[PDB]
Amino acid sequence: AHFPDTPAFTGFNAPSRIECDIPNLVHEGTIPPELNGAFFRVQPDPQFPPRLGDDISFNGDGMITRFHIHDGQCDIKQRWAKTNKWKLENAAGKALFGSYRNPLTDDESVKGEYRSTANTNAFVFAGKLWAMKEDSPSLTMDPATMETFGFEKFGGKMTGQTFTAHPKVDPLTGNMVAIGYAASGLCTDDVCLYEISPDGELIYEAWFKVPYYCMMHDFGVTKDYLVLHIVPSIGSWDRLEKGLPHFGFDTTLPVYLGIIPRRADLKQEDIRWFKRENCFASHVMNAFQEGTKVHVDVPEAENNMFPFFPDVHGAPFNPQQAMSRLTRWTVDMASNSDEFDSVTRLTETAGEFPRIDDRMTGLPYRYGWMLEMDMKRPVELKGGFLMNCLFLKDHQTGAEQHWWCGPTSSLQEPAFIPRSKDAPEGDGWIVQVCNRLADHKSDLLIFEALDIEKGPVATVHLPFALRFGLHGNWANAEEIGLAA
Amino acid sequence: AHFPDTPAFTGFNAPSRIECDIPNLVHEGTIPPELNGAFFRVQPDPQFPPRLGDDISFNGDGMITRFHIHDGQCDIKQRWAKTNKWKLENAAGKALFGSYRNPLTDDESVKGEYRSTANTNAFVFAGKLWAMKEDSPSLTMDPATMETFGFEKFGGKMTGQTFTAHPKVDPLTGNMVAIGYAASGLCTDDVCLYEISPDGELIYEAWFKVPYYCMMHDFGVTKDYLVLHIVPSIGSWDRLEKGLPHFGFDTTLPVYLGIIPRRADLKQEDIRWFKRENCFASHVMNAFQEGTKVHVDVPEAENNMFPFFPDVHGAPFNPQQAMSRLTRWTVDMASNSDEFDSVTRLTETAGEFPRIDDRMTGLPYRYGWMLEMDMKRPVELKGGFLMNCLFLKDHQTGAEQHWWCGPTSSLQEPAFIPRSKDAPEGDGWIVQVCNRLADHKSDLLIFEALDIEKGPVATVHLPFALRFGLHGNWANAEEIGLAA
Ligand SMILES: [Co+2]
Ligand SMILES: [Co+2]
């Protein structure tokens, strides 16, 4: 393959496309013999050179990595998420879909097809692996063999056209809670709220509209509510006609937080929209209710964090204003006005990729993990935020822990592994990929989840480099068809 | 896996164990659209940590790499050679066989089993892929799927216990010509000469004895003869009982060249042994007859080239005396004495891994390629000879060509690809793996075989590193079950 000599395709961003199997990877330290299951994660990774001769990171085809940890060892299985895009392009021997979220640039032969790369999450639910991209229904795969099934539309019961890549699992029921924005077509203001039972059946789909179409990438869930931030990374058909990146950031629009009842009978008038000044947030650590209040914890930045989705008024990207810090947004359902009850920064540590012990989804919670950018640390190699620490916040005491991966490495999203179903919150392990940039390889690190400063208790070496990852998740073996 | 922190297992020698598939590898330049077939090569690569807690490079399990070149692209498929050793150890989850060529160190559970790692050659003949190790019968594999068949003993017609990893194909018949030393058991002085027809049937097996047991790694073949150098890298049960490496070099023993008739009716008295002073040679570029003379071209060194098989009298390894240079050994079957007719250095370039256009096997020939060690070139990274150039010798004119891979890379064995069945000698391409040590990755280089100084016409990037390789070979698609 002839790929462009551009940053999105070179160095740490060289295409990989490795499908492989390696059991019993070389490792150091002690892999807890308690562990029996797998960590799935996804990297965008281009099957073919881009039609336009360049592209962005978020547009690579999804390649799924599974780390099966059992018997004190770690194995890897890596396979493509075989979306319809992947299949059509594979058969044609070339790219057929064009630029990111831009159907105007697709070959006529694939007009009308799902454009999903399934590249944003590798999530386990209902005995399946969900390879997810928020512009289409999710793809599903067999978590044991990593073969691909196809797109999930729930027996026809889903009529929205899209499905999130940030599903939540409500611990009170085991339901998957999901949204789909642009639900009636590209750039539309329609959103669906979906709930899926543990058996994988769609329980309900509820439609509503938002203040303006924007990237609704993530959201929170509580017992009673969908908690949906409206942040003006905006897109439009006009931008696409003009050849601009689908999304751009508008610093002049307000930010909203919508509180949407988790109810099949939802009507638009049931929704409350709280409004605040312009800012940026993408991911949700967790949300929860307290009395008549709703709290959501997000990495908040002053301005846009996506340089590739630039300021709509032509401002150059501002890295300083892109620094995000975990912040609690609180709104009171009993309040008279549409003002937030409070916005409270929870840490001065800058970071992203927030995670919790997912058994706490929607509940008051003590612990949060993030990838941290500590700009005070020495750096000799980079591979444009520098995510160089694992961070743990204790909301009960305020205490913070940090682990630095050293001056030639960076880190990918952590994921929490519970010791047992009814172990206390945070009792378990963190796993995360470490980019060993000087060695052009990756490690999988295993930490004691509440004692990270001493470093990983085990380091699994991969004999190749992973690419930049998006989201990932642990599942125990019994949830994924792997051996007891 | 917990591997030793020793040189044989770290850095460029880290275990890899990658089984993978990647079509359409990222590449630069122009892969000749004429090419349709595959280059197979083998790397020793340990499935498990060694029983003794250390080991040598030559003892890793064979991992087979196939580069399928077609339609102007290159694909990779990498699979284990599943020897009985591999299978038994895989089932046990641990090493069961011990040190190199040392059955005394094996677990009792595998006494009597073939110890082959099938790690020295990946050769195509009779519709099969031969994964070869000279201490056992060859393993065979399906060249298309790279599944393993098992050990080849030719329907019981082979009674020798071993088979070479340096088979030759006689162009006059298409027969495979092979030896097996230590043919009646470890360290024995019995050798078999085998010839196998193009259909894979054993034609004959002829037994003989040699002046002393030694590493009979390679040999030459001409129309009438097996040409067998006897070089005193010697082994014995006594060395193994004392815990020494199987082989050690004895500078006090003579070197012989045996001329053995290629005849099923061979008797010991039919063999002529020519004798010369101590020196070292391992590989054969080619051998051929001229009148009553036999010529064989070998990289000759003053002394041992294997630091891991040390001087039997305790001398430290001498790198200067280990420098090998292509040299013609000529013996006259009509001569009165046992002296060689001549020993003539053919180049001052130091090198190893000699190759020809294999259509010239046993015939007078014009071209030879080698890996060259040019100690005058700058080096910033190494990964203990530094093989940093591809070398081409023209025996007709004397002309030499060199291509240097640069200061942070090294090279693996080249292989010649003919343009067509009746293309002239040397009309075609050279392929070879390049270790890009600074990038911790490998390239496959494609050269115009007689115009190497301009550099490769195509460079295929692998998104991971291969390990040190041994021998490899090209076959056209029709010889290996791949698409026309
Ligand atoms: Co996300
Ligand atoms: Co050899």
Residue numbers in the entry:
A (entry chain A), B (entry chain A): 2 to 384, 389 to 489
Reproduce passages from the article.
Lignostilbene-α,β-dioxygenases (LSDs) are iron-dependent oxygenases involved in the catabolism of lignin-derived stilbenes. LSDs are nonheme iron enzymes that catalyze the O2-dependent cleavage of trans-4-hydroxystilbenes to yield two aromatic aldehydes. LSD4 catalyzed the cleavage of DCA-S to 5-formylferulate and vanillin and cleaved lignostilbene and DCA-S (∼106 M−1 s−1) with tenfold greater specificity than pterostilbene and resveratrol. The overall structure of LSD4 is typical of CCDs: a seven-bladed β-propeller fold with a cap-like feature on one face formed by extended loops.
To facilitate the structural characterization of LSD4·substrate complexes, we generated Co-LSD4 in which the catalytic Fe2+ was substituted with Co2+. This metal ion substitution in CAO1 yielded an inactive but isostructural enzyme. Co-LSD4 was produced by growing cells producing LSD4 in a minimal medium supplemented with Ca2+, Mg2+, and Co2+ as the only divalent metal ions. Inductively coupled plasma–mass spectrometry (ICP-MS) analysis revealed that each protomer of Co-LSD4 contained 0.92 ± 0.06 equivalents of Co2+ and ∼0.02 equivalents of Fe2+. Co-LSD4 had a faint purple hue and a λmax of ∼480 nm. Finally, incubating lignostilbene with Co-LSD4 led to rates of O2 consumption that were barely above background. This is consistent with Co-LSD4 being inactive, with residual activity in the preparation the result of trace Fe-LSD4. Therefore, we prepared catalytically inactive Co-LSD4, a strategy that yielded ligand-bound structures of CAO1 (31, 32). Co-LSD4 crystallized under similar conditions as native enzyme and the two structures were nearly identical, with an RMSD of 0.1 Å over 471 aligned Cα atoms. The coordination geometry of the active site metal ion was also highly similar in the two variants.
